[PDB]
Point group: C2
Chain length 344, copies 2
Amino acid sequence: KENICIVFGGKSAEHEVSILTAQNVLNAIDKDKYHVDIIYITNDGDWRKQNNITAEIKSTDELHLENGELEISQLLKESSSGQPYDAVFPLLHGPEDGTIQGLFEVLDVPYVGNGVLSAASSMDKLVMKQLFEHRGLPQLPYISFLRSEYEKYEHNILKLVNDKLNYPVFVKPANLGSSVGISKCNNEAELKEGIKEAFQFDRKLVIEQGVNAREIEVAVLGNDYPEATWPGEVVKDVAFVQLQIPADLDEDVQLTLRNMALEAFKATDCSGLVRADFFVTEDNQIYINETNAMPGFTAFSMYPKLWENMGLSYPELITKLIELAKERHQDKQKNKYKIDRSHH
Amino acid sequence: KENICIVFGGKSAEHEVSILTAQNVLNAIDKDKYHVDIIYITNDGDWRKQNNITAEIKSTDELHLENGEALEISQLLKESSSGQPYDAVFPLLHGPNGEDGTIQGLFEVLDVPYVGNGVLSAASSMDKLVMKQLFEHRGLPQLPYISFLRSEYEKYEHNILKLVNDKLNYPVFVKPANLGSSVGISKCNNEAELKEGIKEAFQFDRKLVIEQGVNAREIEVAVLGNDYPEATWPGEVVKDVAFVQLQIPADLDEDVQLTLRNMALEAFKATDCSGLVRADFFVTEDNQIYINETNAMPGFTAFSMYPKLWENMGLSYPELITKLIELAKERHQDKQKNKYKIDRS
């Protein structure tokens, strides 16, 4: 029997979605196969652990833990069965991405999903776009700069936005995911204001050409030999979850999107999973928008539903993610041995 | 006094250097200005704390090392033995386990202010392929190179070997992308050697870089700052052949030195560094410049390149340590300020 730790909560009011997600995962997890503990990280950063979850959690209130089992390191290094975890499943963004993965790595705890680089890469929209560019994936025109750069080269930068992009454009802090400080700008005065607004939240920005496009998402699962689902659509009458799986798109367009999703996964060197989010215009021009390293993971979110469409049930998906974590961490340690052995 | 913690040792034989660097740093810190705790990470990865270093560390044996207090990872790591939070934590160790970027992640989770590079910059300059991609986007010159995953070599071996031939001039270097360990690096003079060289590197890493090699001079530039970084004049390790005395500034034309200074700033920005970086270039006999790598955690003994480059600029080793602390606090205040505004929208 394998020991699993679900970690959820977090310093933010991504709180409720994190708790809900944990309920879903806990209630889907195969239980005579998995011994399961939970750690609720409160907002204040108190880690509260409950051991050996056996019953269906009927209510989200159950998971707002009060009591806790030790220090952070002790919480993570040992399962309730007295032995290390086979996998820890983070269902929180760490105060951003990549930080909690660092902590797991320092503790040598096996964990689900993306690693440090890939998590942080995907959370920085500029880095992400540069990785996608190098890989040959199509993207909309954009510009990026640092505050230091804007402070010295404003006129030059604002000229770039005019010669290179068509309004409307979006100004987007590079380093959030929260959508704060995003602004749609229809002209240069709006752009100027958008930049000023945004720099109140971040020291680095991307200015992207807007499009009218469908929002098409592909789920990828794996480590070294990832697989991609048929795409799904986030259907919306107005751009500013209702899902259609598979997406109403030509077969050839679906195949291209599946293969680009695999390329996007590789470009940011993902592990475990990624959701690749595209723009597909009414003429079937395809741009990758972003990858999401920690996609919504509720029983009804796009990422699990894309897998269900392929015949991979939600309990089976969670199992697959866990075995991937196990494999990745096993492979890390084995290469350590070979390297150690080389040094000797 | 301000309150500082130095973290050193780690899961490696980086140990002896890391210990010496901790000594140097500690002896460079004015204890009437700073209250200093240290944390040693043993090879098995146990954290051991020694409080309130007040005297010169005349020898390493005066450090307790494994014999400091047994430390769990907890909110406590933010608190000095004075009972004040640390103003800055100075990591003088790598990612034995994980990558670079992992201890930074731990510090961010615990909201500990720390010196130097953040998660993404640390991790990106430790992955040679991401690093190269970032430098290419920034328009910095680099030697020709190819990269691939094991899974890609597995199914496209022929095409890849032919890409090497059609793109790279032999000899080439096979480099694991994710180690700084030099384990699995090899110099390959033809396809036969390359093939061997690839097979061997894949024993240790799942992603490789193949690079056109060049014998050339190795020239380094130090950069210090967060949002308004400054670069040193370049330096070089003194030697007649390219196949521990430094020359600072390097024996290079002034225009070449200036170009390098500015390239170092660009490399700093390309990997979104904080605190510092060392940019390491190749410069050929005809003054062709290629950035080799950035180093997010460059050697930091009293006699190391990074410190000596600043010394030539008039910034003493103690002043350099104080500046890095001040940049650490600044960065962390900036995060706190940003989180507040974000949260309040």
